[PDB]
């Protein structure tokens, strides 16, 4: 079944810049996250439905994570993707979706909503430790991208 979790977040970066940076995560992520070595497209043009393979290092071991691009709403500053395979996917989960949606915040920044949707296999529910890890993945990426934009303000 489906279990949704939402976190509100803020940034001093305006939402157009963050949104462009999020759209370039394939490029940015390997540079700024040490453990991410590469992002490769398996099928698609980059837009919704595209399947990607991330190569990472975990505990000194090379591993893969599979992503699927879900949605892109430019108008609403929205970028959505799912984990569909690999170590970031718990065995009790079919998939975990990570949505990010931004609006204008006071004084030129952004107000964010990060959403995790866990599609479970059975009636089984996400446990607490797995929710922690999902939130850390979701927010960690958002903050990483944010940090890149704070360091390269003219780029986006």
- Residue 145 CA to residue 9 CA, distance in Å, equals 14
Q: How far is the CB of 35 from Na ion (least distance, A)?
A: 6
Instruction: Identify the burial level of 132 via C-beta atoms within 10 angstroms of its C-beta, where 0-12 means exposed, 13-18 middle and 19 or more buried.
Output: exposed
Which is nearer to Na ion, 30 or 109 (by Cβ)?
30
Is residue 141 exposed (0-12), middle (13-18) or buried (19+ Cβ within 10 Å)? Answer: buried
- Closest distance to Na ion from the beta carbon of 2 (Å): 32
Q: How far is the CB of 37 from Na ion (least distance, A)?
A: 5
Per CB under 5 A, residues contacting Na ion are 30, 34, 36
By C-beta, is 59 or 123 nearer to Na ion?
59
Nearer of residues 28 and 102 to Na ion, judged by Cβ: 28
Q: Which C-beta is closer to Na ion: that of 95 or that of 137?
A: 137
**Taking the complex as a whole, how short is the minimal distance between the CB of residue 152 and Na ion, in angstroms?**
16
CA dist 114 to 43, 86, 97, 135, Å? 26, 22, 10, 9
Rounded to 5 degrees, what angle do the CA atoms 143, 117, 133 make?
50
Shortest reach from residue 30's CB to Na ion, in Å = 5
**Beta carbon nearer to Na ion, 67 or 101:** 67
Q: What is the dihedral of CA 23, 10, 119, 66, to 10 degrees?
A: 30
Paired residues of 5 in beta bridges: 116
């Amino acid at each position: 079944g489906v279990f949704t979790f939402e976190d509100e977040i803020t940034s001093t970066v305006p939402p157009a810049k963050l949104y462009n940076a999020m759209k370039d995560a394939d490029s940015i992520t390997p540079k700024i996250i040490d453990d991410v070595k590469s992002v490769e497209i398996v099928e698609g043009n980059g837009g919704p439905g595209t399947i990607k393979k991330l190569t990472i290092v975990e505990d000194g071991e090379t591993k893969f994570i599979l992503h699927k691009v879900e949605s892109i709403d430019e108008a609403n500053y929205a970028y959505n993707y799912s984990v569909v395979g690999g170590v970031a996917l718990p065995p009790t989960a079919e998939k975990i979706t990570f949505e990010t949606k931004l609006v204008e915040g006071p004084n030129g920044g952004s107000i964010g909503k990060l959403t995790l949707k866990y599609h479970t296999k059975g009636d089984a529910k996400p446990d607490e430790e797995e929710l922690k890890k999902g939130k850390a993945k979701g927010e960690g990426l958002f903050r990483a991208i944010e940090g890149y934009v704070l360091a390269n303000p003219t780029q986006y």
